[PDB]
Amino acid sequence: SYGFQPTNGVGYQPYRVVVLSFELLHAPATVCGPKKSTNLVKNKCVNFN
Amino acid sequence: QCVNLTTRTQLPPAYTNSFTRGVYYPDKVFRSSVLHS
Numbered sequence: 697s698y699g700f701q702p703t704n705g706v707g708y709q710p711y712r713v714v715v716l717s718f719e720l721l722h723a724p725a726t727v728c729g730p731k732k733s734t735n736l737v738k739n740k741c742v743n744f745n
Numbered sequence: 746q747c748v749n750l751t752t753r754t755q756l757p758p759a760y761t762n763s764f765t766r767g768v769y770y771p772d773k774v775f776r777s778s779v780l781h782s
């Protein structure tokens with residue numbers, strides 16, 4: 697164990713770190729951004745996302 | 746309720762051939778009419 701002090705250490709302050717590990721190009725995604733959807737117009741040269 | 750099973754008559758090992766059941770789909774992809782390796 698290390699001596700976690702309020703301010704005596706000055707440096708070496710605690711750091712709460714969280715690491716995210718995404719996995720891409722896989723089975724249908726469960727997590728996505730807040731972007732919304734639109735129609736599915738067919739028989740037309742359209743961009744798709 | 747667990748207990749050692751008595752009358753555990755030891756038996757010789759048994760062997761067989763794997764034949765033609767040893768694979769799976771490596772990825773979530775619908776590659777069709779392809780000879781992918």
Ligand SMILES: *[C@@H]1O[C@H](CO)[C@@H](O)[C@H](O)[C@H]1NC(C)=O
Binds near residue numbers: 748749
């Ligand atoms: C059964 O035998 C095994 C192996 O010696 C032992 O670990 C286990 O505790 C025994 N169970 C009982 C209920 O005596």
